[PDB]
Nucleic acid binder design. Structure first.
Ligand code: CL
Ligand code: CL
Ligand code: CL
Ligand code: CL
Ligand code: K
Ligand code: MG
Ligand code: MG
Ligand code: MG
Ligand code: MG
Ligand code: MG
Ligand code: MG
Ligand code: MG
Ligand code: MG
Ligand code: MG
Ligand code: MG
Ligand code: MG
Ligand code: MG
Ligand code: MG
Ligand code: MG
Ligand code: MG
Ligand code: MG
Ligand code: MG
Ligand code: NA
Ligand code: NA
Ligand code: NA
Ligand code: NA
Ligand code: NA
Ligand code: NA
Ligand code: NA
Ligand code: NA
Ligand code: SR
Ligand code: SR
Ligand code: SR
Ligand code: SR
Ligand code: SR
Ligand code: SR
Ligand code: SR
Ligand code: SR
Ligand code: SR
Ligand code: SR
Ligand code: SR
Ligand code: SR
Ligand code: SR
Ligand code: SR
Ligand code: SR
Ligand code: SR
Lengths: 92, 237, 194, 56
RNA sequence: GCUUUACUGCAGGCUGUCGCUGAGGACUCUCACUCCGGGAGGAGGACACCGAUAGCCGGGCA
RNA sequence: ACUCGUACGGUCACUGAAUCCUGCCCAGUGCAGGUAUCUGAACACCUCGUACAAGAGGACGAAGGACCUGUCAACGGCGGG
RNA sequence: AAACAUCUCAGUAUCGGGAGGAACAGAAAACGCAAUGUGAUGUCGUUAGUAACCGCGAGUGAACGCGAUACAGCCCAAACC
């Protein structure tokens, strides 16, 4: 479906309606320094490694929208529930 | 499953050992200080149980009685020489360096003084081709050009008993007797005729390997069976 | 002023440099030709020996022992095991090589008791340690104020029970506080979890 | 030839005999090892914790 | 119990790297080390063996 | 162990005396060889990051794979129109 | 663990070696109720199923301290001779 790149809506920060710019959430890079990362190293040894021997799951036929809503004046973004959309193209 | 026959062999149990207590002697060249002043006289021709070929008992000048790897054409009474200055005739041993190129040789040493390693079986022979001050090129029975230290000793002539392979065993019983004189378990049951538990090819309603026979060089023992790291198979091409 | 001993010590802080380097390169050639346990008239590291209790006296013996380098020489499981207990290659023993050396030396001299030991280097495939052993039955020792303690019955076969300095360390007994909850007073009394 | 009764007739070999060390008829005269006390195998006396219940 | 391109692992083989290991992306040398030789000495040589680790193969085995 | 053995050897497999014979197929799988380029781990090296370290990235790149070739008395195949 | 691989059963069963009448531990490179504080080590009660671990599942699981028992502190290496 089509999605307007910018539009007026509520900004929970300014606490008033303002223009927002919508962007798809880009995955942030990992650091490899979180607790889970250290547990993987500590608990993996000779033989099967329990949960650390499991491999990536599957995929849903369609994913939900994953967007950021940036306020045009205070510059802060907020998140919203997403809705299943086969494709999401922006207009302008 | 269970270990395959090839794995049982390695343990060196009686069934797989050679009847060593019945073997006669290790036909290694004599060790000469130097000079070649060593000569001996063929005192008798005997049967070597471990090679199905004849061997010659020799009495040397200094009183040493030893069996020797005999070439074809050696008989009782004949005198043999072993040294750097030995004469160039059938039955004599000397370093390759002293041998004239183009002369059939046998019981060639791998490393000078080791006693002989190559061309020792019935009717075979290595062919000394090239000389030099650093390397002596010899053509082994398999056709391979071997580079050897000119200081490697060897016996002139071809090994006695040639043609042994020209006659067929004809019957199982004849194979039987020869096998009883070797370190070999015989007869041979085919892999495809065994149960799955006993061999990679075992099992199945009808006999057939349930897999390609060309096995990788990296395969572990127990699995390395069939055609080992074959560069090709068949007769075609 | 500095003791002459301090010079042997300082040399051994960097066994791979200076004259000591050349000595080892020379020595190991001979060591490699000696047996598993060789009694030697004098410690190779005098400073270390005296420091550990050695004395030039009757009843005091020193022996060099060599042991193969690396992990456990273990046989793969011949019966059922869960993946966890199928390892072979990366398994290491719980006793360090110095401890193994101490025991071999002590077995060679059944009447002697291990006093202490120290390292004298290694090559690519083995390690050498020198072990100080004491004769608890010799009067020159029964009368020594610094060593007579090792004559007590309860010191018999001390090495085999981990009572050696290398033994106590290997048992995780170095620390008196944090970390020694499962080591003191013994690995066994703590259910073998240390 | 059955593995039972008929094969029992061939048994006239002497193996286990009275042991010099422990007195039991367990000294295997072919191996020269006592299966009961370990004589011929070890200076120490043959013993095992499984010869009794674990907690006893 | 048996099978395999089932799951997960484990031996084993190949291969790189570090230690053993020295002198002057290709090279010479000798002194460790290896092999041959009764010995003298010869061959090889910082490789190989061995210890450690990494990638690949891996129903041979669990 | 084989082996007091050395290619006229002995190891690993298939077929199963003699006689007359043994066609076509290398795409898949297996084995083997080659390989400009591609891909390909760790240690060392370089950049960022940290007064250090974790970590992120880069350069190099072995076997292996991609790719090419050989091979069926190698696994096997030899149909429908 | 209602399968099962990490985990659990369990450092249990069993095996190798070794001492004693009891063993082992033990005079801080401790503790960290953070203090102007405690003062070798076992052990018992408690701290506590607490902190911590863990397909963060099933399960596993201390310590400092405190109240007790009993109390005990010393010897070398080196410097200088
Ligand atoms: Cl989206
Ligand atoms: Cl034959
Ligand atoms: Cl002792
Ligand atoms: Cl306190
Ligand atoms: K289990
Ligand atoms: Mg011979
Ligand atoms: Mg036989
Ligand atoms: Mg057959
Ligand atoms: Mg059958
Ligand atoms: Mg099988
Ligand atoms: Mg058939
Ligand atoms: Mg068939
Ligand atoms: Mg004093
Ligand atoms: Mg206790
Ligand atoms: Mg040798
Ligand atoms: Mg299985
Ligand atoms: Mg048949
Ligand atoms: Mg269960
Ligand atoms: Mg565990
Ligand atoms: Mg569950
Ligand atoms: Mg537990
Ligand atoms: Mg604490
Ligand atoms: Na851990
Ligand atoms: Na002893
Ligand atoms: Na069954
Ligand atoms: Na094909
Ligand atoms: Na259950
Ligand atoms: Na089950
Ligand atoms: Na777990
Ligand atoms: Na208090
Ligand atoms: Sr761990
Ligand atoms: Sr693992
Ligand atoms: Sr799906
Ligand atoms: Sr020989
Ligand atoms: Sr010889
Ligand atoms: Sr089959
Ligand atoms: Sr053909
Ligand atoms: Sr004893
Ligand atoms: Sr029968
Ligand atoms: Sr009958
Ligand atoms: Sr009988
Ligand atoms: Sr015995
Ligand atoms: Sr016992
Ligand atoms: Sr035929
Ligand atoms: Sr092919
Ligand atoms: Sr006190």
């Amino acid at each position: 479906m089509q999605m307007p790149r910018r539009f007026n809506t509520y900004c929970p920060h300014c606490n008033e309606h303002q223009e927002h710019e919508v962007e798809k959430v880009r995955s942030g890079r990992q650091t490899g320094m979180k607790w889970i990362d250290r547990q993987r190293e500590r608990n993996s040894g000779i033989g099967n490694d329990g949960k650390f021997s499991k491999v990536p799951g599957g995929d849903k036929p369609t994913k939900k929208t994953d967007l950021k809503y940036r306020c045009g004046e205070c510059g802060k973004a907020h998140l919203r529930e997403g809705w299943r959309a086969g494709r999401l193209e922006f207009q302008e | 499953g269970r270990r395959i026959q090839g794995q049982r062999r390695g343990r060196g149990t009686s069934t797989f050992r050679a009847p060593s207590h019945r073997y006669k002697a290790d036909l290694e060249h004599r060790k000469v200080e130097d000079g070649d002043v060593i000569a001996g006289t063929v005192v008798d021709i005997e049967h070597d149980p471990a090679r199905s070929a004849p061997v010659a008992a020799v009495e040397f000048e200094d009183g040493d009685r030893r069996l020797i790897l005999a070439p074809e054409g050696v008989g009782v009474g004949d005198e043999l020489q072993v040294g750097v200055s030995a004469e160039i005739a059938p039955g004599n041993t000397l370093p390759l360096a002293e041998i004239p190129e183009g002369v059939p040789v046998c019981n060639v040493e791998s490393s000078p003084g080791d006693g002989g390693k190559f061309a020792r079986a019935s009717g075979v022979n290595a062919q000394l081709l090239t000389h030099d001050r650093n390397v002596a090129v010899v053509k082994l029975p398999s056709g391979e050009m071997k580079r050897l230290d000119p200081q490697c000793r060897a016996t002139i002539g071809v090994v006695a008993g040639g043609g042994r392979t020209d006659k067929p065993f004809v019957k199982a019983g004849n194979k039987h007797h020869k096998m009883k004189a070797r370190g070999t378990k015989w007869p041979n049951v085919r892999g495809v005729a065994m149960n799955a538990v006993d061999h990679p090819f075992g099992g199945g309603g009808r006999q057939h390997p349930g897999k390609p026979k060309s096995i990788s060089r990296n395969a572990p023992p127990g699995r390395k069976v069939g055609d080992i790291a074959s560069k090709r198979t068949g007769r075609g091409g | 002023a500095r003791s002459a001993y301090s010079y042997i010590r300082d040399a051994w802080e960097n066994p791979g440099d200076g004259q000591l380097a050349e000595l080892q390169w020379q020595r190991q050639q001979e060591w490699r030709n000696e047996g598993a346990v060789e009694r030697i008239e004098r410690p190779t590291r005098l400073d270390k020996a005296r420091s550990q209790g050695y004395k030039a006296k009757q009843g005091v013996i020193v022996a060099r022992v060599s042991v193969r380098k690396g992990s456990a020489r273990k046989r793969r499981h011949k019966a059922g095991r869960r993946s966890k207990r199928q390892g072979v290659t990366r398994i290491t023993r719980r006793k360090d090589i110095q401890r193994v050396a101490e025991e071999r030396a002590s077995r060679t001299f059944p009447n002697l008791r291990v006093l202490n030991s120290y390292s004298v280097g290694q090559d690519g495939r083995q390690k050498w340690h020198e072990v100080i052993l004491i004769d608890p039955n010799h009067p020159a020792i029964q009368n020594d104020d610094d060593l007579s303690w090792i004559c007590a019955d309860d010191q018999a076969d001390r090495v085999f029970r981990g009572l050696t300095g290398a033994g106590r360390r290997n048992r995780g007994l170095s620390g008196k506080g944090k970390g020694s909850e499962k080591t003191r007073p013994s690995l066994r009394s703590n259910g073998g979890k240390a | 030839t059955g593995a039972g009764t008929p094969s029992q007739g061939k048994k006239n070999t002497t193996t286990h005999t009275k042991c010099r060390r422990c007195g039991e008829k367990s000294y295997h005269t072919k191996k020269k090892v006592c299966s009961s006390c370990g004589f011929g195998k070890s200076a120490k006396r043959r013993d095992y914790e499984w010869q009794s219940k674990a907690g006893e």
